[PDB]
Amino acid sequence: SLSAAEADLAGKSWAPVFANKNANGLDFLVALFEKFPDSANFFADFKGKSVADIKASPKLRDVSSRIFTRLNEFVNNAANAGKMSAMLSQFAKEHVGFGVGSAQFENVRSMFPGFVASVAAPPAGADAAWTKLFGLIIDALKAAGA
């Protein structure tokens, strides 16, 4: 888990992003697809489609919303190793079943700080807190088998 201090920094940086959940959630998915094209292929709903096609899809909101909803939960419980344990396990288990592994998360981790900064400058230390949180997710994926 993250420390209380680290967790607070992540929460602080996330707030402005989550303020506009719908628009920001869609934008995150789109930025992911643009920077890491192969990522779309894992999605039944977006495999083979171009970014323009994805943007125009009535399914985008459903997928993006579920992701943001869960990320918010990770941010909220990040400082509680216990809650994290369960969340991580479950998260990893679910992802692996879909064929998603740690490599994909390594990509999310690389682009995340930049995405946040595009909404509002994050406080000092927030970047390192996100990397640590993603690190925890990456570790979980590896234990889950991928």
**Can you say which residues are annotated as belonging to the binding site for heme b?**
95
Q: Rule CB under 6 A: is residue 67 a binding residue for ligand HEM?
A: yes
Q: How far apart are CA 116 and CA 52, in angstroms?
A: 22
Size of the site for ligand HEM (CB under 6 A): 13
On the CB side of 57, CA atoms within 13 Å amount to: 22
Q: Rule CB under 6 A: is residue 117 a binding residue for ligand HEM?
A: no
Collect all residues with Cβ–Cβ distance below 8 Å to 137 and sequence separation of at least 6.
74, 88, 91, 92, 105
Residue number, 61 or 66, with CB nearest to ligand HEM: 66
What is the identity of the amino acid at 122? P
> What distances in angstroms separate CA 37 from CA 2, 11, 93, 135, one per listed residue?
30, 28, 24, 22
Q: How far apart are CA 68 and CA 79, in angstroms?
A: 19
Residue number, 25 or 79, with CB nearest to ligand HEM: 25
Q: Rule CB under 6 A: is residue 70 a binding residue for ligand HEM?
A: yes
Under rule CB under 6 A, which residues in 77-116 are in contact with ligand HEM?
A: 98, 100, 104, 108
Residue number, 1 or 104, with CB nearest to ligand HEM: 104
Residue number, 6 or 112, with CB nearest to ligand HEM: 112
Site of interaction with ligand HEM (CB under 6 A): 39, 42-45, 66-67, 70-71, 98, 100, 104, 108
